[PDB]
Amino acid sequence: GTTPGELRELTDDELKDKLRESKEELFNLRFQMATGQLSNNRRLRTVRQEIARVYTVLRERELG
Amino acid sequence: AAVCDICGKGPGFGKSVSHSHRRTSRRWNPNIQPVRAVTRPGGNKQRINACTSCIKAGKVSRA
Amino acid sequence: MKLILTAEVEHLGAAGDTVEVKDGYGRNYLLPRGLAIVASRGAERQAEEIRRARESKVIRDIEHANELKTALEGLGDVTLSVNAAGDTGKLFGSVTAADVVNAIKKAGGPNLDKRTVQLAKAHIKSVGTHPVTVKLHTGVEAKVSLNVVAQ
Amino acid sequence: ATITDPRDIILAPVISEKSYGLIEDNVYTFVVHPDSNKTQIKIAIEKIFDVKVDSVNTANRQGKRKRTRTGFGKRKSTKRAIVKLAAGSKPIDLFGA
RNA sequence: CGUGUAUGUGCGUCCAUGAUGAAUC
RNA sequence: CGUAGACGGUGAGAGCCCGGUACGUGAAAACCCGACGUCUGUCUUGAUGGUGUUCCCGAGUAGCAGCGGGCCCGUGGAAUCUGCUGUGAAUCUGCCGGGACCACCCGGUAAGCCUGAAUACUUCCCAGUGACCGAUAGCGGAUUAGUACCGUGAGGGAAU
RNA sequence: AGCUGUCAACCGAGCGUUGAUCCGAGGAUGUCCGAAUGGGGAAACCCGGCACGAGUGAUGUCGUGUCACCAGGCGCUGAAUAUAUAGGCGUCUGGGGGGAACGCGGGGAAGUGAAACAUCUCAGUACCCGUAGGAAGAGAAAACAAAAUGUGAUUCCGUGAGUAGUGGCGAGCGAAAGCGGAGGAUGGCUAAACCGUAUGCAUGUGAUACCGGGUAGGGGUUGUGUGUGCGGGGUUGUGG
């Protein structure tokens, strides 16, 4: 539910809010992984690339 | 002492040849002299190095 | 060095004479001190030498003449024509010391050397009145009021 | 855009016997970004956990050089932030014990 | 080394509150 | 039957098993060369092919001298080209070259000039080839390779 | 209709029709160092000003862009005196460095050979320096030739030729003309009596006016020399 089309539909403020949410989620995932209580360790990569997508869409909007 | 500041004339290089015909590297330096040249006729001078060729051709003004 | 005497030089010749001198004599004394000009294209040089002699004789400021011209500075405003724009007054042809001397000698008769004009300090770059200093000696600095009129 | 988050500075907790002793003493150890500083770490932890940080201690640890058929390979250098919270200082339970 | 508070205003302000020569042959 | 028996792989010599090969062919985008456009100076505003005597028209250069460089030319009879030093030419009846000079002459018009494409090479990329090597060979390096190791360093430098 | 690079196996996961992994092109991000350039430095570490906030009972702190060193327009000032300059200040455009070979220019060895050795050779080599370009100068003949109806913008290749020559005439070195080919085209400034034309110093006689022929006026190109530069006057050897 984080496809580039959806991200581009979202607004700049909404994109930054989803950006911060994904950063909080990545922080939580890192902490669970370090404590040994993250079953789906691919969540880290999924959230990292979701952050990458949010940056990419924001920078695309900044450029034009 | 070997490069003119006007035409850029620099030292040539050749051989000094002895009677035994020993050839040794040497320089033909330009005859550049320290000239207090006056670029504009306003009056202020500036010490540059100009070859006597430039001094003779009038490319230095000692105004 | 073939050169035309602009003034008198003892044992060399009279003002306006063509002379062959050693290059060093013509380059370190005559040309720098203005006692001659090189015998360049004769058509121009012939008049140039005599014009220089006349300008030197007419523009010379003696010690007393310095105060004399300071007193004469009571002249009114001196007009100067310059090719400028009619909106802002920007000067297409910037004023010159020779131009100021010409305007001064046209309006009145204080002949002066262009070098005594503080044109850059005046910094006219416009149309209208622009006071200009004329330094005639080490202690006399007349102030002329030059009006600028567009072309 | 560069939307900075303090959670970028805090990378992970330290799970060890000394770390747990400090936690029971109410002092939490984190793996922080190498180019961080104590003030930045304090600000980040305060904003993250809504706690009051009393002191932040940091230490740089060199990565161990391990042997292998190829040769010597060095692990990543880590900066550890040891954070002493205030008296009340709602404990940071996110360490998962 | 800094911030929010209180103690005193230790002198002067828009005034008044001291020092200075302020002018002629 | 193969208009496709190139080369490889596949459990051992495969045209017909696979990648492919001869050849049905393919590019949104980006980058390279084509046609037509917008865009850019000069003329019709008398030159243009003929007529004719006289005046004016490329410099510290050419030349020369000293000392060198380079030309087959090692200074020689030493031309042409050229560095530095000094001295220093008019306008075509000029000047320079033809390895002195009258010149019979011929060739060309330097120095103020400047300016074009068509030949060498391969870090790199693509496709190939070999009466080349085949693990002490071939690159130092088929393997951690400019690594290990040695050296303060430049640097040297494997074995597998 | 397989997929999370590999050495290189072992959890977790998603990919499909919401077309995988992979391949190609264009973009984004691109820490720090390095010409490294905000300053410094033991290449991988410390700041200034701008605008953000960041909470704040508050102060460090963090992100983003920007800040090194010549010349030139718009420009501004003009020290020592005269300033009519050097410098200072703003802005803008460029350079720093690297790269295997090849190019051009310049500097330039010695082993070595001469059976010694210095001329000479090695060798204009190795190396070095400065600089490119995709290729690099000349260049549209102060050219060659030899009395020929000669060739004809320039470079490379083959010959000429290991010849002519050159050379302690030793060791060695060593062309060009001509001829056969590769490729193929003769571009532009241009100076010149006089000008449309802005700036030096003189010039009010305000006329010998500057009009390009005469032809009457006339207070007019400012009446008179000019060096500079954008176009003319306009431009090869059998000149303009």
From Swiss-Prot, chain A:
GO terms for biological process: translation. Belongs to the universal ribosomal protein uL29 family. This is Large ribosomal subunit protein uL29. GO terms for molecular function: structural constituent of ribosome. The lineage of its organism: Bacteria, Bacillati, Actinomycetota, Actinomycetes, Mycobacteriales. GO terms for cellular component: cytosolic large ribosomal subunit. Coiled coil: none annotated. The keyword Ribosomal protein applies. Disulfide bonds: none annotated. It comes from the Bacteria. The keyword Cell membrane does not apply. Keywords: Ribonucleoprotein, Ribosomal protein.
From Swiss-Prot, chain C:
GO terms for molecular function: rRNA binding; structural constituent of ribosome. One of its GO terms (cellular component) is ribonucleoprotein complex. It comes from the Bacteria. InterPro entries: Ribosomal_bL9, Ribosomal_bL9/RNase_H1_N, Ribosomal_bL9_bac/chp, Ribosomal_bL9_C, Ribosomal_bL9_C_sf, Ribosomal_bL9_N, Ribosomal_bL9_N_sf. Keywords: Ribonucleoprotein, Ribosomal protein, RNA-binding, rRNA-binding. One of its GO terms (biological process) is translation. PROSITE patterns: RIBOSOMAL_L9. SUPFAM superfamilies: L9 N-domain-like, Ribosomal protein L9 C-domain. Belongs to the bacterial ribosomal protein bL9 family. Binds 2-aminothiazole antibiotics, which are antitubercular agents. Binds to the 23S rRNA. This is Large ribosomal subunit protein bL9. It comes from Mycolicibacterium smegmatis (strain ATCC 700084 / mc(2)155).
Swiss-Prot record, chain D:
One of the early assembly proteins it binds 23S rRNA. One of the proteins that surrounds the polypeptide exit tunnel on the outside of the ribosome. Forms the main docking site for trigger factor binding to the ribosome. PROSITE patterns: RIBOSOMAL_L23. The keyword Amino-acid biosynthesis does not apply. This is Large ribosomal subunit protein uL23. One of its GO terms (molecular function) is structural constituent of ribosome. Part of the 50S ribosomal subunit. Contacts protein L29, and trigger factor when it is bound to the ribosome. It comes from Mycolicibacterium smegmatis (strain ATCC 700084 / mc(2)155) (Mycobacterium smegmatis). One of its GO terms (biological process) is translation. Keywords: Ribonucleoprotein, Ribosomal protein, RNA-binding, rRNA-binding. HAMAP family: Ribosomal_uL23_B. The keyword Ribonucleoprotein applies. It comes from the Bacteria.
